[PDB]
Amino acid sequence: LAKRIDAALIMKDGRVVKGSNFENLRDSGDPVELGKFYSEIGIDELSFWDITASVEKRKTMLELVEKVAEQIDIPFTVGGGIHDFETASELILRGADKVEINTAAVENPSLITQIAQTFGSQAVVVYIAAKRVDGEFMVFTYSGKKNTGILLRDWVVEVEKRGAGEIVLGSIDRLGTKSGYDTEMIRFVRPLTTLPIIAHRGAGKMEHFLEAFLAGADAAKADSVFHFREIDVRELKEYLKKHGVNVRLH
């Protein structure tokens, strides 16, 4: 099916960290209005990642998804320190289509299955942050701080086995580089899973998306290149369609 273009939003205290350059918006740093705007100009799905401090976090994330679900009609994902089934459950019930987990999944893979058994696999997104170490792709947790010693190939297979719906494949080797998506990593992972693969980290120009899709990604996620208007979302989809990529245009 159609290749997907995702926008990611980083959040703290109900605000978009670093905001955005869309001066047409009432509040360029308002996650809800920005999300709604993206949904209007052609983003296919949104993802919200919250880094609010522990005291206010739960209520902040629940308010956000509630407001977002009311204002937008495309699927969205919420994530950020989701550590257990009850937290994931209340976010989905409150309005999220999907939850994103990473570290908590690595430490308890059955959490994937737990969430999927009530909300279906399609509600579970596993973010995998991977990096080359001595010639092998390794899984990293705790915001890139911990080398788990787990091989990417092994974790990808387990993640599907546990019942995840899709995988976000984040290349730590491409963090803030604008040199392109890690297409070697995408090609490496593609044969190991039937799940949708969402490319993340590295995007700097429209051609990088084409490359990502050629590598076998089902979706491409970016943030700052969208928010600071280095890449126009509408042009991006036009470009991709131009060169043969199937994108979308009770």
Backbone as a ProteinNet text record, in pm:
[ID]
protein_1_A
[PRIMARY]
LAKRIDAALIMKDGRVVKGSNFENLRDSGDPVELGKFYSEIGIDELSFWDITASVEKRKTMLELVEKVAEQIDIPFTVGGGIHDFETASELILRGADKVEINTAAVENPSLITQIAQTFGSQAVVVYIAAKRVDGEFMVFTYSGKKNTGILLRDWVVEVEKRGAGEIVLGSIDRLGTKSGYDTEMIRFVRPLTTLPIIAHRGAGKMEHFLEAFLAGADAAKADSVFHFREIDVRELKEYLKKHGVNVRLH
[TERTIARY]
82.1	0	85.9	20.1	88.2	196	310.6	414.1	360.3	403.2	346.8	448.9	403.8	491.3	443.7	527.5	490.4	562.7	493	559.5	565.7	683.9	699	706.3	636.4	640.5	693.7	798.1	849.7	777.4	736.1	653.9	700.7	678.3	701.6	604.3	525.7	430.6	326.8	281.8	182.4	235.6	367.8	429.7	522.7	529.1	624.3	764.6	852.6	991.2	1054.6	1100.1	1158.7	1053.8	927.6	818.7	832.1	780.4	787.7	788.2	821.9	836	711.8	598.3	473.8	407.5	439.6	390.7	241.3	181.7	38.2	-44.9	20.2	-48.5	-67.1	-179.1	-206.9	-97	-57.5	50.9	138	256	345.3	400.2	389.5	438.8	330.1	208.1	94.4	83.4	110.9	108.9	-20.2	-132.1	-261	-283.8	-261.8	-284.5	-184.2	-58.6	44.7	10.2	-41.1	-80.2	-194.1	-291.4	-406.5	-362.2	-268.1	-217.8	-146.9	-56	10.8	-90.1	-194.2	-296.9	-368.7	-372.1	-439.1	-351.8	-221.3	-133.2	-68.2	-105.7	-67.8	16	45	107	9	57.7	-32.3	-63.7	37.6	17.1	104.4	67.2	147.1	198.6	310.4	354.9	393.3	349	377.6	464.7	578.9	670.1	681.5	641.8	637.1	757.1	816.8	928.7	900	771.5	726.8	779.8	807.4	857.2	755.5	806.1	725.9	597.1	599.5	483.3	362.4	384.6	275.1	250.9	343.3	347	215.8	163	46.7	-72.4	-99.3	-214.1	-192.4	-68	-30.2	-49.6	-2.1	-15.7	-162.4	-239.9	-381.6	-461.4	-433.3	-496.3	-460.5	-333.6	-288.5	-362.6	-366.3	-428.9	-577.7	-637.9	-780.2	-806.3	-727.5	-737.6	-705.3	-601.2	-563.3	-671.6	-724.4	-826.2	-950.1	-978.7	-1092.5	-1069.6	-944.3	-911.6	-862.2	-816.8	-760.8	-824.8	-814.6	-880.7	-784.3	-654.9	-556.9	-507.5	-454.9	-404.9	-289	-280.7	-164.2	-118.5	7.6	74.9	122.2	120.4	176.1	281.7	385.4	490.3	565	659.5	740.3	721.6	808.3	803.8	677.6	622.5	512.9	570.1	543.7	618.5	533.8	401.6	313.8	180.5	104.2	-20.5	-123.3	-134.4	-239.8	-214.4	-89.5	-60.4	-94	-53.2	-83.6	-235.8	-304.9	-449.9	-523.2	-487.7	-561.6	-535.4	-414.9	-386.7	-464.9	-475.4	-552.6	-701.8	-754.5	-895.7	-929.2	-834.7	-854.1	-849	-800.6	-802.9	-690.9	-578.3	-467.1	-501.4	-454.1	-471.4	-367.3	-246.9	-131.5	-47.3	21.5	123.5	258.5	360.8	497.5	578.7	643.3	728.5	864.8	965.3	1098.9	1163.5	1219.9	1292.8	1206.2	1081.3	996.3	970.8	967.8	949.5	1073.7	1191.3	1314.4	1323	1285.1	1300.1	1189.7	1072.9	966.5	891	943	881	734.4	692	551.7	459.8	515.4	434.3	371.1	444.2	397.1	270.2	278	168.2	49.4	79.8	-21.6	-111.2	-48.1	-120.6	-196.4	-128.9	-191.8	-313.9	-315.5	-425.7	-556.5	-547.9	-668.8	-696.2	-590.1	-605.6	-563.5	-518.5	-475.2	-331.2	-263.8	-125.6	-110.9	-210.7	-199.8	-190.6	-222.4	-212	-71.9	12.8	145.8	257	328.3	444.8	570.8	667.3	794.1	900.9	953.7	1068.1	1197	1276.6	1406.4	1514.8	1595.2	1710.3	1832.1	1894.5	2004.3	2129.7	2244.8	2372	2474	2565.4	2675.1	2775	2808	2911.8	2996.2	3125.3	3214.8	3154.2	3100.5	3047.4	2909.5	2844.4	2709.2	2609	2485.5	2376.5	2329.6	2341.4	2300.2	2182.2	2098.6	1984.1	2027.6	1990.7	2021.9	1897.5	1903.3	1789.8	1827.4	1730.6	1751.6	1808.6	1737.4	1774.1	1914.7	1949.6	2078.6	2192.7	2165.7	2272.9	2319.9	2230.8	2266.1	2273	2392.2	2410.7	2358.2	2245	2181.1	2257.6	2347.1	2410.2	2316.5	2198.7	2102.2	2118	2132.5	2143.9	2011.4	2017.4	1901.2	1824.7	1894.8	1823.9	1742.9	1797.4	1724.5	1601.5	1618.6	1510.4	1395	1427.2	1325.3	1236	1297.2	1222.1	1133.8	1189.5	1114.2	996.4	1022.1	920.8	797.7	819.3	707.4	639.8	721.3	672.1	580.2	615.9	541.8	409.5	392.8	266.6	265.8	382	384.6	320.2	273.7	206.3	300.1	390.7	491.5	617.8	725.9	853.8	902.4	934.6	1011.5	1158.5	1232.7	1373.1	1456	1502.8	1576	1725.7	1796.8	1941.4	2013.2	2070.6	2148.4	2268.6	2319.6	2427.3	2389.5	2263.6	2217.7	2157.7	2166.9	2108.8	2159.7	2070.6	2105.8	2217.2	2207.8	2314.8	2273.6	2143.6	2089.2	2155	2224.3	2294.6	2209.1	2090.1	2001.1	1963.3	1855.4	1816.7	1923.8	1933.7	2029.3	1975.9	1996.4	1932.8	1993.5	2120	2180.5	2110	2081.3	2006.8	1866.4	1797.2	1663	1667.1	1763.1	1777.1	1812.6	1889.9	1925.7	1801.7	1715.8	1598.1	1484.8	1471.4	1358	1327.9	1430.4	1400.7	1361.3	1387	1368.5	1227.5	1144.7	1010.2	908.6	784.1	671.8	603	644.3	583.8	618.1	529	568	691.9	782.5	904.3	897.7	910.9	912.9	1053.5	1108	1244.1	1249.4	1353.9	1370.4	1517.9	1546.7	1680.6	1758.6	1806.3	1892.3	1837.8	1705.8	1643.1	1686.6	1728.8	1767.1	1703	1674.1	1611	1516.9	1431.6	1326.1	1379.6	1500.2	1552.9	1581.6	1609.7	1636.8	1517.2	1397.2	1274.8	1260.8	1285.5	1288.7	1385.1	1507.3	1607.5	1553.6	1491.5	1435.6	1336.1	1249.1	1146.3	1204.2	1306.5	1375.4	1437.8	1485.3	1546.3	1444.4	1315.5	1211.8	1129.8	1153.6	1071.6	926.6	832.2	690.3	645.6	725.2	696.2	825.5	820.3	934.5	889	954.9	920.3	1028.2	986.5	1079	1011.3	1089.2	1043.2	1094.2	1216.9	1272	1274.5	1303.1	1303.2	1164.5	1061.5	926.4	899.1	927.2	888.1	960.6	1083.5	1159.8	1153.3	1069.4	1031.8	1149	1241.6	1350.6	1298.3	1194.7	1124.4	976.5	915.7	771.7	704.2	604	540.4	468.5	401.6	324.1	415.9	522	622.8	684.1	711.9	772.3	688	557.8	471.6	460.5	465.4	458.7	582.2	697.9	825.2	824.9	776.8	775.7	682.8	565	470.2	530.5	592.8	661.4	758.2	832.6	933.5	891	759.9	707.5	664.6	684.9	649.1	498.9	436	294.2	271.8	245.4	202.1	57.1	-4.5	-143.1	-154.9	-243.7	-267.7	-416.1	-1963.2	-2107.8	-2176.6
-120.7	0	126.3	241.8	370.2	391.1	443.1	488.2	603.8	607.8	696.8	803.1	926.9	1032.1	1072.9	1052.6	1082.9	1206.2	1290.3	1398.6	1366.9	1380.8	1360.4	1493.7	1502.3	1622.8	1592.6	1663.9	1648.7	1746.8	1699.1	1779.3	1781.7	1896.6	1915	2020.4	1983.5	2074.1	2126.2	2039.7	2077.3	2167.6	2179.7	2264.7	2186.2	2226.5	2165.4	2216.3	2127.4	2164.9	2221	2346.3	2428.3	2484.7	2447.8	2500.5	2477.9	2571.7	2560.5	2697	2697.2	2820.2	2859.1	2797	2832.6	2953.3	3072.2	3197.5	3219.4	3136.3	3143.3	3088.4	3014.4	2953.1	3051.7	3038.3	3120.5	3100.3	2974.8	2940.1	2835.1	2876.5	2788.6	2674.7	2689.7	2589.4	2505.7	2517.8	2440.9	2309.2	2196.8	2062.2	2029.9	2077.7	2043.8	2117.6	2248.5	2325	2284	2264.2	2219	2082.7	1993.1	1861	1870.8	1955	1975.2	2033.8	2126.9	2189.1	2087.7	2009.1	1902.4	1809.3	1772.4	1681.4	1741.8	1874.5	1942	1946.4	1965.3	1984.2	1855.4	1740.7	1613.8	1513.4	1541.7	1440.5	1323.6	1199.5	1083.6	1039.2	1037.8	1009	1101.6	1120.7	1202.7	1120.1	1161.2	1096.8	1204.9	1187.7	1282.2	1212.7	1272.9	1215.7	1311.9	1267.7	1359.9	1342.6	1454.4	1450.6	1536.5	1553.9	1624.1	1557.6	1638.4	1588.1	1497	1403.1	1291.7	1332.3	1445	1485.5	1518.8	1591.6	1637.5	1548	1455.5	1377.6	1307.6	1226.5	1143.9	1228.3	1335.4	1420	1499.6	1540.2	1620.3	1539.3	1415.3	1328.3	1293.6	1269.2	1236.9	1355.3	1476.4	1595.7	1615	1593.6	1612.7	1520.3	1389.8	1298.8	1330.7	1374.8	1407	1520.9	1627.6	1743.5	1710.3	1630.4	1592.3	1508.8	1407.7	1318.7	1395.8	1503.3	1588.2	1673.6	1711.6	1810	1752.4	1627.4	1570.4	1436.7	1400.8	1281.4	1177.9	1206.7	1106.9	1031.4	908.9	833.4	904.2	888.7	940	846.3	863.5	779.2	867.9	814.6	889.6	802.4	865.8	791.6	879.9	820.3	894.1	837.9	745	687.5	609.7	545.1	452.5	318.4	283.5	177.6	56.1	68.7	-40.9	-40.7	-148.6	-164.8	-59.6	-28.6	64.7	203.5	247.6	378.6	379.1	274	262.2	258.8	178.6	162.7	296	373.6	497.4	600	601	687.9	648.7	519.3	475.4	508.1	471.1	495.5	643.6	726.9	871.2	933.8	858.8	907.5	864.2	816.5	776.4	653	648.3	527.5	422.1	469	382.7	437.5	347.4	389	339	417.9	386.3	352.9	237	198.2	156.6	164.8	125.2	55.7	134.7	77	-21.7	15.2	-73.1	-205.5	-201.2	-323.4	-411.8	-352.4	-431.4	-499.3	-427.6	-486.2	-585.5	-568.2	-667	-685	-772.4	-789.9	-829.9	-893	-932.3	-809.8	-691.8	-569.4	-545.2	-582.3	-570.1	-652.7	-776.6	-869.5	-826.1	-774.1	-727.4	-623.7	-523.8	-413.9	-465.6	-545.8	-600.9	-689.3	-758.1	-850.8	-775.7	-651.9	-572.6	-478.5	-421.3	-315.7	-355.3	-479.1	-525.9	-485.3	-563.7	-536.5	-398.4	-355.9	-229.8	-108.6	-128.1	-20.6	-12.3	-109.6	-115.5	-83.7	25.1	63.2	42.5	-33.1	-44.5	39.3	139.3	215.7	140.6	112.8	48.9	146.5	186.3	272.6	183.2	183.8	91.9	166.8	104.5	166.7	58	84.7	-5.8	-6.5	-125.7	-142.5	-262.8	-240.4	-347.1	-429	-360.4	-427	-490.8	-479.7	-533.2	-421.9	-435.8	-347.5	-385.9	-294.1	-321.7	-236.4	-292	-220	-137.8	-10	80.3	129.9	137	186.8	310.7	365.4	483	599.7	638	752.2	739.1	618.3	593	567.8	571	561.7	419.4	322.2	184.2	92.8	38.6	-70.8	-198.2	-248.3	-366.5	-496.2	-496.2	-620.9	-708.6	-656.1	-729.9	-690	-788.8	-765.8	-719.6	-616.3	-566.7	-682.4	-771.6	-878.3	-962.8	-989.6	-1071.8	-998.2	-870.4	-791.8	-768.4	-736.2	-724.2	-848.6	-966.1	-1090.7	-1114.7	-1091.9	-1102.2	-1004.8	-881.2	-776.6	-818.7	-873.5	-923.2	-1042.3	-1133.4	-1250.2	-1210.8	-1103.7	-1060	-992.7	-955.6	-900.3	-752.1	-692.4	-550.6	-528.7	-406.7	-373	-314	-228.4	-173.5	-139.4	-119.9	-85.4	47.9	139.3	256.9	226	242	208.1	335.5	372.7	496.7	472.1	536.2	519.9	622.8	578.5	667.9	721.7	639.8	681	797	841.1	948.2	1063.4	1055.7	1156.8	1297.9	1384.6	1520.9	1535.3	1462.2	1461.4	1516.7	1514.8	1558.5	1495.9	1383.8	1321.3	1216.4	1190.8	1090	984.1	910.9	797.8	689.9	609.8	500.6	387.9	396.1	299	159.3	150.2	18.1	-55.4	17.5	-39.9	-84.8	-1.5	-36.8	-164.6	-172.8	-290.9	-414	-393.7	-502	-557.6	-468.5	-510.3	-565.9	-512.6	-547.5	-697.6	-782.6	-926.5	-995.5	-931.5	-997.5	-980.7	-901.6	-878.1	-846.1	-885.7	-849.3	-723.2	-674.3	-552.2	-427.5	-327.3	-198.9	-143.2	-90.5	-28.6	120.4	195	339.8	391.9	456.3	507.5	632.6	646.6	768	805	935.1	995.2	1002.3	1121.8	1139.9	1226.9	1242	1313.8	1459.1	1502.1	1640.6	1700	1616.4	1665.5	1560.5	1602.5	1516.6	1387.4	1392.7	1274.4	1164.3	1204.6	1107.5	1018	1071.4	993.4	889.2	932.1	838.5	723.3	757.3	656.5	561	618.6	538.5	437.1	481.9	393.9	289.4	327.7	232.3	121.8	160.2	66.2	-27.8	2	-88	-38.9	84.4	143.8	156.8	141.2	156.7	297.5	364.5	499.8	571.4	703.6	784.4	892.6	898.4	992.4	1098.9	1223.9	1332.1	1433.8	1530.9	1630.6	1769.4	1801.4	1936.1	1984.4	1895.3	1935.7	1979.9	1927.3	1975.1	2103.1	2100.4	2209.8	2339.4	2328.6	2448.1	2475.6	2398.2	2420.4	2406.8	2317.8	2281.6	2192.6	2114.9	2038.4	2070.3	2108.1	2129.1	1995.3	1966.1	1835.8	1813.1	1916.4	1901.5	1878.2	1957.3	1937	1797.4	1751.5	1620.5	1511.4	1515.6	1413	1423.2	1545.6	1568.7	1507.9	1540.5	1484.3	1330.9	1271.1	1126.4	1064.9	1124	1074.5	1089.4	1203.9	1229	1117.2	1065.5	967.5	825.7	801.4	665.3	608.8	685.6	640.1	650.4	541	545.9	614.7	744.8	816.2	861.7	905.5	950.5	1100.9	1138.4	1279	1308.3	357.4	377.5	269.7
0	0	0	3.1	-10.2	96.2	52.5	143.9	226.7	352	450.5	486.6	503.4	553.8	693.7	795.5	934.1	986.3	1061.8	1133.2	1282.3	1341.9	1486.3	1561.2	1673.8	1756.5	1896.1	1938	2074.2	2165.9	2282.8	2371.2	2514.4	2577.6	2719.8	2771.1	2871.7	2935.6	2837.1	2746.6	2648.3	2538	2527.2	2424.3	2331.7	2205.1	2112.9	2141.7	2185.9	2210.5	2083	2093.9	1986.5	1890.8	1910.6	1830.1	1680.2	1601.2	1455.7	1386.3	1257.3	1179.4	1100	1130	1063.1	1129.5	1079	1136.3	1111.5	1026.5	1000.3	1116.2	1205.5	1318.5	1433.2	1504.1	1621.6	1724.9	1742.6	1833	1765.7	1721.1	1646.3	1733.3	1865.3	1958.7	2023.9	1973	2022	1945.2	2013.6	1955	1883	1935.5	1877	1745.6	1745.1	1623.2	1514.6	1554.6	1461.2	1401.8	1485.7	1440.3	1341	1373.9	1287.8	1154.3	1160.3	1039	949.5	1007.7	933.6	868	942.9	891.8	771.3	766.3	656.9	532	549.2	434.3	382.4	438.2	377.8	456.3	583.1	668.5	679.5	680.1	686	830.5	916.6	1059.4	1144.1	1270.4	1359.8	1476.2	1533.9	1656.3	1755.1	1879.5	1986.6	2090.1	2120.8	2218.9	2336.6	2455.8	2569.8	2662.6	2702.7	2796.7	2919.7	2949.2	3068.9	3197.2	3299.9	3428.4	3497	3575.7	3624.6	3698.3	3768.9	3847.7	3761.3	3652.3	3567.4	3446	3421.3	3297	3260.8	3352.2	3319.4	3275.7	3349.8	3321.1	3192.9	3170.8	3054	2925.8	2927.5	2811.4	2785.1	2890.6	2872.5	2815.3	2862.9	2806.7	2660.6	2628.8	2492.3	2396.7	2425.9	2330.2	2320.4	2430.6	2430.3	2333.2	2346.3	2258.6	2113.1	2091.9	1956.5	1888.4	1958	1900.9	1855.7	1927.1	1897.3	1772	1748	1644.9	1512.8	1512.5	1390.3	1353.3	1225.4	1173.8	1117.2	1122.3	1080.2	1203	1183.6	1299.9	1370.9	1502.5	1572.9	1684.2	1719.8	1815.9	1929.4	2050.8	2161.2	2228.5	2281.6	2347.1	2443.2	2514.8	2609.6	2748.2	2785.8	2919	2948.4	2846.2	2868.9	2914.3	3039.8	3108	3139.8	3127.9	3166.6	3089.4	3105.5	3031.4	3070.7	3199.6	3238.8	3179.8	3177.3	3117.1	2966.8	2896.4	2754	2732.8	2814.3	2801.6	2815.6	2917.4	2940.3	2829	2771.8	2656.1	2529.7	2502	2385.9	2407.7	2524	2552.8	2546.4	2587.6	2590.8	2451.5	2353	2216.4	2122.9	2176	2088.3	2005.4	1881.1	1800.8	1834.4	1866.3	1888.5	2002	2071.4	2164.5	2116.9	2147.5	2113.2	2238.8	2238.7	2349.1	2295.9	2382	2342.7	2462.1	2552.6	2666.6	2745.1	2772.9	2853.8	2780.6	2647.4	2570	2579.3	2565.3	2574.8	2712.2	2816.8	2948.8	2980.6	2920.1	2935.8	2805.4	2718.5	2586.9	2595.7	2705.6	2717.6	2725.3	2753.7	2753.4	2615.1	2510	2372.2	2356.7	2402.6	2390.1	2476.6	2595.7	2690.3	2624.2	2564.1	2502.8	2381.5	2299.3	2179.4	2210.7	2324.4	2349.9	2375.5	2422.4	2444.2	2327.2	2270	2170.7	2029.5	2013.1	1882.6	1855.1	1771.3	1732.3	1672.5	1595.3	1522.7	1615.3	1742.8	1841.6	1905.2	1874.2	1936.3	1837.2	1864.3	1786.1	1870.9	1821.2	1894.8	1825	1895.9	1846.8	1881	1778.5	1795	1753.5	1851.3	1831.5	1818.4	1700.7	1672.9	1627.6	1648.8	1614.4	1588.4	1495.9	1467.5	1582.7	1630.7	1731.6	1692	1668.1	1621.1	1507.1	1406.4	1289	1299	1415	1432.8	1467.5	1419.6	1461.2	1600.8	1696.8	1835.4	1877	1963.9	2018.9	2140.1	2141.6	2253.4	2324.6	2457.2	2534.4	2617.4	2691.4	2776.8	2697.4	2591	2506.8	2449.1	2408.2	2348.3	2445.7	2576.4	2677.2	2701.9	2684.3	2716.1	2594.9	2570.2	2477.3	2543.8	2495.2	2553.4	2526.3	2427.6	2386.5	2303.9	2272.1	2192.5	2045.7	1959.3	1815.9	1759	1676.3	1604.4	1539.5	1470.3	1400.6	1497.8	1616.8	1713.1	1768.8	1801.7	1860.7	1761.1	1636.2	1532.2	1525.2	1527.8	1517.8	1642.2	1760.6	1884.6	1890.3	1850	1849.4	1767.2	1647.9	1568.4	1638.3	1689.9	1761	1878.5	1949.2	2067.7	2033.1	1907	1860.8	1828.1	1803.8	1767.2	1629.3	1605.2	1481	1378.1	1423.4	1335.2	1412.1	1337.9	1397.5	1346	1437.1	1400.3	1419	1310.5	1306.4	1309.5	1428.5	1445.4	1445.1	1352.1	1341.9	1426.2	1537.5	1622.4	1542.8	1451.2	1359.9	1266	1268.2	1178.7	1256.7	1388.7	1476.4	1444.2	1396.7	1359.6	1256.6	1145.8	1046.3	909	879.9	750.1	626.2	642.7	530.6	459.4	512.6	457.1	559.9	532.6	615.5	607.6	713.1	716.6	630.8	498.8	410.7	422.5	462.4	484.6	599.4	706.7	818.9	777.3	700	653.7	570.9	478.4	392.3	472.8	578.7	669.6	739.9	788	865.1	777	655.5	567.3	551.7	528.9	516.3	647.6	761.1	890.5	945.6	878	930	820.6	845.8	760.6	812.3	929.1	984.4	904.2	907	849.9	919.3	837.9	886.4	863.5	972.2	967.2	987.5	884.5	891.4	977.4	1058.3	1138.1	1154.1	1152.4	1169.7	1038.8	1006.1	890.7	778.7	771.8	660.4	654.5	535.8	512.8	388.1	288.8	167	109	16	-36.7	-94.8	-150.3	-217.4	-115.7	7.7	113.8	138.3	116.7	134.7	25.4	-97.9	-210	-180.1	-139.6	-102.4	5.7	108.5	218.1	165.2	75.1	22.8	-71.3	-146.5	-231.5	-145.3	-26.9	68.3	133.4	117.8	165.4	284.1	327.7	432	386.2	479.2	447.6	480.9	563.5	606.1	640.8	640.4	676.6	772.4	887.3	991.7	1000.7	1012.5	1036.5	1126.6	1173.3	1269.4	1232.6	1272.5	1254.8	1107.9	1012.6	871.8	829.1	894.6	869.6	948.5	1079	1168	1134.3	1085.9	1051.8	901.6	833.3	693.8	596.1	629.8	540.9	428	457.5	355.3	364.7	252.5	249.2	229.6	311.3	306.3	173	123.2	0.7	-120.1	-129.9	-234.2	-227.7	-105.8	-86.5	-148.7	-124.7	-179	-331.6	-383.1	-526.9	-592.8	-536.1	-579.2	-579.5	-471.5	-461.9	-565.6	-582.7	-682.9	-823.8	-848.4	-975.1	-1012.5	-915.2	-947.9	-913.8	-914.4	-912.7	-777.6	-671.3	-536.7	-515	-473.3	-436.6	-302	-305.1	-185.7	-202.2	-92.8	-94.9	-119.1	-210.9	-243.3	-265.4	1747.4	1745	1828.2
[MASK]
++++++++++++++++++++++++++++++++++++++++++++++++++++++++++++++++++++++++++++++++++++++++++++++++++++++++++++++++++++++++++++++++++++++++++++++++++++++++++++++++++++++++++++++++++++++++++++++++++++++++++++++++++++++++++++++++++++++++++++++++++++++++++

